[PDB]
Design an enzyme around this catalytic site. Structure first.
Site, PDB file in Angstrom:
ATOM      1  N   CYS A  58     -76.890  52.362 -25.178  1.00  0.00           N
ATOM      2  CA  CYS A  58     -77.058  52.102 -23.740  1.00  0.00           C
ATOM      3  C   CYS A  58     -78.542  52.167 -23.368  1.00  0.00           C
ATOM      4  O   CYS A  58     -79.293  52.927 -23.971  1.00  0.00           O
ATOM      5  CB  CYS A  58     -76.220  53.015 -22.862  1.00  0.00           C
ATOM      6  SG  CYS A  58     -74.434  52.860 -23.172  1.00  0.00           S
TER       7      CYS A  58
ATOM      8  N   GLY B 142     -75.016  55.478 -28.103  1.00  0.00           N
ATOM      9  CA  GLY B 142     -76.472  55.673 -28.139  1.00  0.00           C
ATOM     10  C   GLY B 142     -77.242  54.408 -27.800  1.00  0.00           C
ATOM     11  O   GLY B 142     -78.454  54.528 -27.567  1.00  0.00           O
TER      12      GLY B 142
ATOM     13  N   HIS C 268     -75.790  56.459 -15.878  1.00  0.00           N
ATOM     14  CA  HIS C 268     -74.729  57.275 -16.533  1.00  0.00           C
ATOM     15  C   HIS C 268     -75.342  58.237 -17.565  1.00  0.00           C
ATOM     16  O   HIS C 268     -74.592  59.052 -18.130  1.00  0.00           O
ATOM     17  CB  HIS C 268     -73.579  56.396 -17.027  1.00  0.00           C
ATOM     18  CG  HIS C 268     -73.845  55.706 -18.315  1.00  0.00           C
ATOM     19  ND1 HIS C 268     -73.681  54.335 -18.485  1.00  0.00           N
ATOM     20  CD2 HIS C 268     -74.188  56.202 -19.516  1.00  0.00           C
ATOM     21  CE1 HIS C 268     -73.937  54.022 -19.738  1.00  0.00           C
ATOM     22  NE2 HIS C 268     -74.254  55.142 -20.384  1.00  0.00           N
TER      23      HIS C 268
END
Ligand SMILES: C[C@H]1CN(C(=O)Cn2cccn2)CCO1
Ligand SMILES: C[C@H]1CN(C(=O)Cn2cccn2)CCO1
Lengths: 304, 304
Positions: A145, A143, A41
């Site tokens: 991830c 932030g 993603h």
């Protein structure tokens, strides 16, 4: 003495964390050998996230669109591929700090350490469990991830989790390092509700053993039970069923303490039915279930 | 979202841990520059510990009696001195992994990370607070002495604690890195009882703010209070008195949430008087006091 919610030392993982940027999305990557692993993603706009077609979005991406920064030095991306829900960015430099490592897919009730990172930089480390509904209860801001979960077993860093998502209920979902989600979750900004977050019974029993080993003994009662009797009460309290495999796993703690596993089950049964009455066990007012039997042995024995 | 008991990433401290042996006592040392810091009780027999005269015991010790091993390589000891309750072993090699660092003496209620070590090897990391009675509630087995407590503030590793002792009640006592005990404790195997372990009120209020920020809001009530009214209830519940300095420190969390500090005090007052009624806040059945206001801001903002 003393029993703490303890993470693995994070240094070996700190040395693997990098920043991945695609357009204006920055998140974290894991740099092992000459591959950087990150959530796919990274390629999405927040609009893309509502209904992303990752294969189609990726056609628009070249190696040079993935910016990988290790400290304040840029790594050259020489290849990229999608594996399930992760990207593998091949870089021209092997991570010189790559530890011995494995990718493992853990089972619900298994614990691990998370190194929460932002912009490829470590902010903190904490201990998690894979919940029976395949969520984790983390601490993850925008932030974070690509932050990873790991165990350090037998001179090998076993990576078991990469952070992808926060559900609308504020619990967390992610993948193993092959990019397969834990549970039914998807990397899409849609209605995803978690199932029942049951208590990990075998872990509670392990932690009651830890409590006895550390002198917290007030809850030990004069009763025993059977797995079937115990399980009828467990079911009623949204505890996971206890199996003979769980009883076998608790054998060493039973031996060390001289408390038969089924006796400890009957102590747990009375705690469920009677409550804590304002008392604490190992400084907790609820029954802790994020210590595995292996965690209790490790911490009670001082493994390095 | 989510709020976790989070330690600092431990890598910078892992790179400083060594093994110190004197005769058949092995424990941990901290290697910064060309000095190794360790508990002076490394020189004691368990019999010595009943009534040790450290100056007299040390006369019998030469540089070559202190064995310092960093990984599986021996460091050459070229000098030793006693500073309060620590030994400083001068070695011929500066630690190449020495981080930027400071020694700080913390105040009760301040939190820090502990890297629990055995034989100079890291086993785990957890978050502690200096209790108001100057004990800590750690997880420390035989061999863990010389394990350190630290914060990582403003690109500087601030060492604040070195482990020395377990009291008969199984709570922990140690020194700053100048070798001065926190509290009234001594490195002698004698009757040492801890004072009242009061709750760190300012930290509870910080954690209630964290709870509101993370959507746990059920405990917010329609009342306010004054510091004097609140403190009368605090005193009764073995909570630390709240000062205007504490109110000032909570200002940023008050601003972020729009809940006046004294309103949150009145919510805490009702929680004390009424109890939790079987409810949880941030997954806890008791009021957590091992997060400082700075910890809540750091974790809620994602500092690296
Ligand atoms: C050359 C690398 C190797 N590192 C290791 O941690 C090795 N290791 C893994 C498990 C046990 N030991 C990290 C820093 O530099
Ligand atoms: C040469 C040393 C330097 N190290 C640092 O952590 C530097 N540092 C401290 C605070 C912020 N940065 C550890 C490994 O090698």
């Amino acid at each position: 003495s003393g029993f703490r919610k303890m993470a693995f030392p994070s240094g070996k993982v700190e040395g693997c964390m990098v920043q991945v940027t695609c357009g204006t999305t920055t998140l974290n990557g894991l740099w092992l050998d000459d591959v950087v692993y990150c959530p796919r993603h990274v390629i999405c706009t927040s609009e893309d996230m509502l209904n992303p077609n990752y294969e189609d979005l990726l056609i628009r991406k070249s190696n040079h669109n993935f910016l990988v920064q290790a400290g304040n030095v840029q790594l050259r991306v020489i290849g990229h591929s999608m594996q399930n829900c992760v990207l593998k960015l091949k870089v021209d430099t092997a991570n010189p700090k790559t530890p011995k490592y494995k990718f493992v897919r853990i089972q619900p009730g298994q614990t691990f350490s998370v190194l929460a990172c932002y912009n490829g930089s470590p902010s903190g480390v904490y201990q998690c469990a894979m919940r029976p509904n395949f969520t984790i209860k983390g601490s993850f801001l925008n932030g974070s991830c690509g932050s990873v979960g790991f165990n350090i077993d037998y001179d090998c860093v076993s990576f078991c989790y990469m952070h992808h998502m926060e559900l609308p209920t504020g619990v967390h979902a992610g993948t193993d390092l092959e990019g397969n989600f834990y549970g039914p979750f998807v990397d899409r900004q849609t209605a995803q509700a978690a199932g029942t977050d049951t208590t990990i019974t075998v872990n509670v029993l392990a932690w009651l053993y830890a409590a006895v080993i550390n002198g917290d003994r007030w809850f030990l009662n004069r009763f025993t039970t059977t797995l079937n009797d115990f399980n009828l009460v467990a079911m009623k309290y949204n505890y996971e069923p206890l199996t003979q495999d769980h009883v076998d796993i608790l054998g060493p703690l039973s031996a060390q303490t001289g408390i038969a596993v089924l006796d400890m089950c009957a102590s747990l049964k009375e705690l469920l039915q009677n409550g804590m009455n304002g008392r604490t066990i190992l400084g907790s007012a609820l029954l802790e279930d994020e210590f595995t039997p292996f965690d209790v042995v490790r911490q009670c024995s001082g493994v390095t």
